[PDB]
Amino acid sequence: GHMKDLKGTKTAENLKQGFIGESMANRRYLYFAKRADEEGYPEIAGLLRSIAEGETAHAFGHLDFIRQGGLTDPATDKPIGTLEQMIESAIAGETYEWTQMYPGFAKVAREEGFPEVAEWFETLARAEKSHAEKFQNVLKQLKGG
């Protein structure tokens, strides 16, 4: 019963929302752990890091149900059944970010008078272009053998 079709269901949408929240929880808790680290709270830092592993398990399980239910990647709306498809999903999202999202964010940051945040968004646009090209070169290797 693991392969029941989830397309068009509310449950499909709920898996995507769960994946988003679990992804953020891991990042948040590892960021908070660094504050605990600096201040000298190793037990708190360690708890944050261990709970973060929990949120990894939660996120990965949501992606298993997404993949098995015939759903697409929460970030890109691309299929992620095969390794080739996974890499194509990575390329699609990186391409969105370097062609559109980060340059757009930089332009708006400059307009609103946040040049330091704009510089950061421009760095990230260049970074996601580098990422897209490296994934493009790997895909070429996969599809060539």
Q: Return the residues of window 17-46 that contact Co ion according to CB under 5 A.
A: 22
Cα-based distances in Å from 62 to 21, 25, 128: 11, 14, 25
Footprint of its own copies on 97-136 (CB under 8 A): 97, 101-102, 104-105, 108-109, 112-117, 120-121, 124, 127, 131, 134-135
Q: Do the Cβ atoms of 74 and 111 come closer than 8 Å?
A: no
Footprint of Co ion on 78-107 (CB under 5 A): 94
- The structure tokens listed for 89 are 């999903």
CA 17, distance to chain mean position in Å, is 13
Measured CA to CA, the distance from residue 32 to residue 74 in angstroms comes to 25
Footprint of Cl ion on 12-51 (CB under 5 A): 41, 43-44
Q: Do the Cβ atoms of 109 and 135 come closer than 8 Å?
A: no
Footprint of its own copies on 59-88 (CB under 8 A): 59-61, 63, 65, 69, 73-75, 80, 83, 86-87
Residues making up the binding site:
22, 55, 58, 94, 97, 128, 131
Indicate whether 91 belongs to the interface with its own copies (CB under 8 A): no
Chain residues in the site for Co ion (CB under 5 A): 1-2, 22, 55, 58, 94, 128, 131
